[PDB]
Amino acid sequence: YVMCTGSFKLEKEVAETQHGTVLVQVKYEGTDAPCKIPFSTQDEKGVTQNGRLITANPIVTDKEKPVNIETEPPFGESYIIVGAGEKALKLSWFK
């Protein structure tokens, strides 16, 4: 599938698991589903931190239905980015 070009919203509060990860429930606003969810994690400085995504190949099936995304944030301040473009959903996180 092609990468999602649209915007994402949070369907519910970000939930902390009992294994140092977070569950992000995202809602897709674009019209190009089925599509692959653009996902990235950054440090306080804004440098991309690799291999933090737990959910393998997150995909939007139906835009009306939200998608669960599990990610492992690093210790301290970080940023969880869902979607493509400069206007993408950027979540400030502290672990």
Epitope: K9, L10, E11, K12, E13, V14, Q25, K27, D62, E64, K65, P66, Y79, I80, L89, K90, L91, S92, W93
Partner: single-chain antibody
Framework: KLLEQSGAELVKPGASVRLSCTAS????????MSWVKQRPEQGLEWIGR????????KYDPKFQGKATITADTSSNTAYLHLSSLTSGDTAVYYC?????????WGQGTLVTVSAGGGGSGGLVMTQTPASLAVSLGQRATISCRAS??????????MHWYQQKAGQPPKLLIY???NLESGIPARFSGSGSRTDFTLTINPVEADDVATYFC?????????FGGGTKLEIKR
């Protein structure tokens, strides 16, 4: 419309009533379902929300001892239960879905409390101006000030709605500055933490409506008092 509500109710004072809200196309389990009260010609009042995945309920303190919210994921339905009905309960009740603004609304259910004795009644959002007389083609500005910080995860959970006569509200802006899909570019939002602004530039004839801001970072997900926008007379 993906949210279908039960029919109008005519109920006796002191009695109880249950309203239903059935979803189609998506699982209510995967969302936050809210109930919103609107007394005749008055503002939107957030009653509470249920997370049907775990059954968690949160209410505005004003509704404690008046409203109860339940959900049934099996039948994809959310319910509102009102106790000891009084004239103050006569209103249109809407169900809605969403956290970063309510993009989905039911058509509303009118509850009319009949005449007679019986029943009992049981964060600050400052929206200005209460009334706005506009010149078409001008820049129209509506402000909302919260008594507490509305930011979460470095984003401002401030949303804006438009409501036209005899219609449910429509989401315009979410997360303070993000334009809802299908909304014209003349609508823009700005602000952070406690101070926010909705700008309509240039204002057009079809923008005549009542506008509401709302915060949702933490409960209660309080609406502003509203701004009735009309063309100057």
């Amino acid at each position: 419309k993906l949210l279908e509500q039960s029919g109008a109710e005519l109920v006796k004072p002191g009695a109880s009533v249950r309203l239903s809200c059935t979803a189609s196309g998506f699982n209510i389990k995967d969302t936050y379902m809210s109930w919103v009260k609107q007394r005749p010609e008055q503002g939107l009042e957030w009653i509470g929300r249920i997370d049907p995945a775990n059954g968690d309920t949160k209410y505005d303190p004003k509704f404690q001892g008046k409203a109860t919210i339940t959900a049934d994921t099996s039948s994809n339905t959310a319910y509102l239960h009102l106790s000891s009905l009084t004239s103050g309960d006569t209103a249109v009740y809407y169900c809605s879905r969403g956290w970063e603004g309510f993009a989905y609304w039911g058509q509303g259910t009118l509850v009319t409390v009949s005449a007679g004795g019986g029943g009992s009644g049981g964060l600050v959002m400052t929206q200005t101006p209460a009334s706005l007389a506009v010149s078409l083609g001008q820049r129209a500005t509506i402000s909302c000030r919260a008594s507490e910080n509305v930011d979460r995860y470095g984003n401002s959970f401030m949303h804006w709605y438009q409501q036209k006569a005899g219609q449910p509200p429509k989401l315009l802006i979410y997360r303070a500055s993000n334009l809802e899909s299908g909304i014209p570019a003349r609508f823009s939002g700005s602000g952070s933490r406690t101070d926010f602004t909705l700008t309509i530039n240039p204002v057009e004839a079809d923008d005549v409506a009542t506008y509401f801001c709302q915060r949702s970072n933490e409960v209660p997900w309080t609406f502003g008092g509203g701004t009735k926008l009309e063309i100057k007379r």
